[PDB]
Design an enzyme around this catalytic site. Structure first.
Site, PDB file in Angstrom:
ATOM      1  N   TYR A  15     -45.010 -45.713  24.652  1.00 21.87           N
ATOM      2  CA  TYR A  15     -43.717 -44.516  25.861  1.00 21.87           C
ATOM      3  C   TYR A  15     -45.576 -45.141  26.948  1.00 21.87           C
ATOM      4  O   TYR A  15     -45.663 -44.025  28.109  1.00 21.87           O
ATOM      5  CB  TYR A  15     -43.875 -42.968  25.645  1.00 21.87           C
ATOM      6  CG  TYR A  15     -43.384 -43.216  24.405  1.00 21.87           C
ATOM      7  CD1 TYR A  15     -41.982 -43.692  24.378  1.00 21.87           C
ATOM      8  CD2 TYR A  15     -43.762 -42.273  23.106  1.00 21.87           C
ATOM      9  CE1 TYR A  15     -40.964 -43.369  23.436  1.00 21.87           C
ATOM     10  CE2 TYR A  15     -42.918 -42.200  22.146  1.00 21.87           C
ATOM     11  CZ  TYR A  15     -41.713 -42.480  22.431  1.00 21.87           C
ATOM     12  OH  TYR A  15     -41.106 -41.983  21.096  1.00 21.87           O
ATOM     13  N   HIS A 128     -41.766 -38.113  15.535  1.00 18.66           N
ATOM     14  CA  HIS A 128     -43.615 -37.786  15.428  1.00 18.66           C
ATOM     15  C   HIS A 128     -44.289 -37.786  15.098  1.00 18.66           C
ATOM     16  O   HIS A 128     -45.566 -37.167  15.019  1.00 18.66           O
ATOM     17  CB  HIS A 128     -43.573 -37.881  16.763  1.00 18.66           C
ATOM     18  CG  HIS A 128     -42.810 -38.867  18.124  1.00 18.66           C
ATOM     19  ND1 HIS A 128     -44.149 -40.226  18.181  1.00 18.66           N
ATOM     20  CD2 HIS A 128     -42.051 -39.207  18.812  1.00 18.66           C
ATOM     21  CE1 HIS A 128     -43.384 -41.003  18.397  1.00 18.66           C
ATOM     22  NE2 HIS A 128     -42.110 -41.268  19.303  1.00 18.66           N
TER      23      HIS A 128
HETATM   24  C1  LIG Z   1     -37.818 -42.145  20.467  1.00 21.51           C
HETATM   25  S1  LIG Z   1     -37.852 -40.102  21.894  1.00 21.51           S
HETATM   26  C2  LIG Z   1     -36.166 -39.997  22.256  1.00 21.51           C
HETATM   27  C3  LIG Z   1     -36.269 -39.373  23.251  1.00 21.51           C
HETATM   28  C4  LIG Z   1     -34.328 -38.777  23.669  1.00 21.51           C
HETATM   29  N1  LIG Z   1     -34.289 -37.756  22.398  1.00 21.51           N
HETATM   30  C5  LIG Z   1     -33.610 -39.551  23.171  1.00 21.51           C
HETATM   31  O1  LIG Z   1     -32.833 -39.793  22.847  1.00 21.51           O
HETATM   32  O2  LIG Z   1     -34.029 -40.216  24.920  1.00 21.51           O
HETATM   33  C6  LIG Z   1     -38.844 -39.397  21.039  1.00 21.51           C
HETATM   34  C7  LIG Z   1     -39.622 -37.865  21.933  1.00 21.51           C
HETATM   35  O3  LIG Z   1     -39.670 -37.005  21.296  1.00 21.51           O
HETATM   36  C8  LIG Z   1     -40.726 -36.779  22.516  1.00 21.51           C
HETATM   37  N2  LIG Z   1     -42.099 -36.261  21.283  1.00 21.51           N
HETATM   38  C9  LIG Z   1     -42.723 -36.359  20.178  1.00 21.51           C
HETATM   39  N3  LIG Z   1     -43.527 -35.155  19.801  1.00 21.51           N
HETATM   40  C10 LIG Z   1     -42.964 -34.544  20.727  1.00 21.51           C
HETATM   41  C11 LIG Z   1     -43.377 -33.276  20.364  1.00 21.51           C
HETATM   42  N4  LIG Z   1     -44.073 -32.285  19.533  1.00 21.51           N
HETATM   43  N5  LIG Z   1     -42.486 -31.489  21.513  1.00 21.51           N
HETATM   44  C12 LIG Z   1     -41.638 -32.647  22.430  1.00 21.51           C
HETATM   45  N6  LIG Z   1     -41.448 -33.802  22.257  1.00 21.51           N
HETATM   46  C13 LIG Z   1     -41.972 -34.958  21.758  1.00 21.51           C
HETATM   47  C14 LIG Z   1     -41.965 -37.818  22.541  1.00 21.51           C
HETATM   48  O4  LIG Z   1     -42.535 -37.496  24.186  1.00 21.51           O
HETATM   49  C15 LIG Z   1     -40.668 -38.357  23.642  1.00 21.51           C
HETATM   50  O5  LIG Z   1     -39.755 -38.200  23.800  1.00 21.51           O
END
Ligand SMILES: C[S@@+](CC[C@H](N)C(=O)[O-])C[C@H]1O[C@@H](n2cnc3c(N)ncnc32)[C@H](O)[C@@H]1O
Length: 263
Positions: A15, A128
């Site tokens: 990211y 994640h």
């Molecule tokens: C592959 S992206 C998908 C984002 C969005 N849902 C989309 O479809 O475009 C995964 C997202 O999960 C977020 N993320 C990872 N761990 C997280 C956490 N512990 N709490 C909230 N968000 C989290 C990341 O920052 C990232 O924006």
């Protein structure tokens, strides 16, 4: 929390600002996961909500999903994402929408009252979290849902580890993903008391999405290079090439999960 998400690693790698913009190129504006608005339309095709509903988006990213849900249903939407720079962009792009809120926080550090949400929605974000942290999250989701409320998730899943090869293990390590098989993921959700659980393999659909995403990218290579870098071009192309190859051999999978809190 068992294993805190490595925020700085994520911001420096998957990211990065350049990485995020490259994802928007391949998936479409406001989206950084599989299928962009196309998959979102499909995933929500059976969902019914109205202007008085309240929805949580876990991992709201740049806000595409929240915008879509609010546009389609008129619902109050609350997006949570651990990545502040994304949340900032999401806010900036949705200043017109009084019923959309974005919040920069680790979802594992969020507390919401019992019976807050009509739906909890998450798209390729729970990958994640460690196994233990997924379980803690699902227990929270159960509390946060209203009676009859719906949990709706897509997420990356995988074959058993003995079938992983060096290139797949390298990808997982680079991404800091924790993946598991679809039915194990479904079982985890069931173990948190959710009813009407569906745990479905939508890898065939995923492959359809990947193939068209990649072919469109290659058709637009020269245009991409005007705005973005060859480094990001090759990162996208090689990344999709390996996802396509690994889903064809059932190594990397796309899981769909729907469940309901029933009293
Ligand atoms: C592959 S992206 C998908 C984002 C969005 N849902 C989309 O479809 O475009 C995964 C997202 O999960 C977020 N993320 C990872 N761990 C997280 C956490 N512990 N709490 C909230 N968000 C989290 C990341 O920052 C990232 O924006």
């Amino acid at each position: 929390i068992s294993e805190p998400v490595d925020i700085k690693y994520l911001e420096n790698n998957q990211y990065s600002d350049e990485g995020i913009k490259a994802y928007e190129f391949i998936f479409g504006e406001d989206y950084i996961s599989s299928g962009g608005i196309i998959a979102t339309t499909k995933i929500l095709s059976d969902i019914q909500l109205d202007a008085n509903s309240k929805v949580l988006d876990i991992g709201s990213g740049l806000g595409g999903g929240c915008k879509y849900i609010n546009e389609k249903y008129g619902a109050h939407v609350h997006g949570v994402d651990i990545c502040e720079k994304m949340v900032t962009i999401a806010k900036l792009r949705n200043q017109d929408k009084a019923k959309i809120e974005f919040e920069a926080k680790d979802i594992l550090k969020k507390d919401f009252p019992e019976s807050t949400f009509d739906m909890i929605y998450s798209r390729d974000s729970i990958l994640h979290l460690s196994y233990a942290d997924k379980k803690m999250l699902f227990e929270k989701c159960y509390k946060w849902l209203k009676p009859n409320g719906i949990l709706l998730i897509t997420d990356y899943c995988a074959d058993k580890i003995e079938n992983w090869d060096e290139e797949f293990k390298a990808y997982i390590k680079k991404r800091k993903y924790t993946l598991m098989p679809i039915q194990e993921y479904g079982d985890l959700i069931k173990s948190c008391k959710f009813q009407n659980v569906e745990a479905k393999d939508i890898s065939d659909y995923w492959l359809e999405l990947l193939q068209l995403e990649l072919s469109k990218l290659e058709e637009k290579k020269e245009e991409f290079l005007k705005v973005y870098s060859i480094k990001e071009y090759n990162s996208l192309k090689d990344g999709w090439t390996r996802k396509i190859k690994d889903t064809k051999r059932d190594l990397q999978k796309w899981g769909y999960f729907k469940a309901q809190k029933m009293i």
